[PDB]
Amino acid sequence: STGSATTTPIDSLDDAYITPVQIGTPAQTLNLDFDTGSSDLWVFSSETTASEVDGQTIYTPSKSTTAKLLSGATWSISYGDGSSSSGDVYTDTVSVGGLTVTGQAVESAKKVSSSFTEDSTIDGLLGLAFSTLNTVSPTQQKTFFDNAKASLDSPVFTADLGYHAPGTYNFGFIDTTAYTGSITYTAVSTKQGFWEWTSTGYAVGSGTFKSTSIDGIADTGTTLLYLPATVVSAYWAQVSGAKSSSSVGGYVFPCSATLPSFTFGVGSARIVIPGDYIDFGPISTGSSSCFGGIQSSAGIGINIFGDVALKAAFVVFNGATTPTLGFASK
């Protein structure tokens, strides 16, 4: 089997991407944030505290003939951005882009943090990191991909995120028309539960390439590119007027600037992030200070190849017995 679904930016900045997901019988379609940095499929629901729901579409398990309470199971998650959610668990039928999993753990939110409530466009998350990170207790549950894997034509999914445009998540096949050149594959460590890999270096603009190992995670659920402070400083030093603002919470730059590209290495291959991808617009409406899309990972504890980086590539998440990651230009 295979599946193919379009993923759509939630706003004009590509702050996140939503993908329609069919849950239950008859189908209830919710728009979920596919997140390769976590491993829970959780949804706003009929059980979510009413004051914490503001415009989201909810899953109502009582209206699904295939829903079954997973008795005794609870979940609770906190994300790297400080947001959180928790609740109980149902199993139900879940389909993405024509690919159907029966018995998928659907984690129903009883509580969500402010950040989720305030974002009307995201109805929940669909985790695509390794199932060892799943928070369901006392019986850890498998991700959608893990459940689908054996049925897939090939044990892979691909992320093809658009810049200011829709893109595609495919399951079970590699669309050879979706990228240019060849795909370069690179080793993955699953020791922390992430799609963790080592970039071979970087360049700023038309500058020379610096060969240096950068360990980080491929994370579709993080907006920006978070890298070591050395790398980030070297980038922003090429933008006149750019500075790190402790009050704003990262590097800002004059909105009048033209940003240089940023290149990262995948083996001997190179992915180029155009300068425009690194512009996240005014820090507040009407401001002439703009927020940068490359930020320091210092104090996160890990480097994160978020959407800024991933959207510059066609990315293969290879879930074979020894997982690997593939990157191609497009």
Swiss-Prot record:
The active site is at D35, S199. It catalyses: Hydrolysis of proteins with specificity similar to that of pepsin A, prefers hydrophobic residues at P1 and P1', but does not cleave 14-Ala-|-Leu-15 in the B chain of insulin or Z-Glu-Tyr. Clots milk. The keyword Protease applies. It is an enzyme of class 3 (hydrolase). Keywords: Aspartyl protease, Disulfide bond, Hydrolase, Protease, Signal, Zymogen. Residues 17-328 form the Peptidase A1 domain. One of its GO terms (biological process) is proteolysis. Its EC number is 3.4.23.22. Belongs to the peptidase A1 family. This is Endothiapepsin. It comes from Cryphonectria parasitica (Chestnut blight fungus). The chain holds residues 90 to 419 of 419 of the full protein.
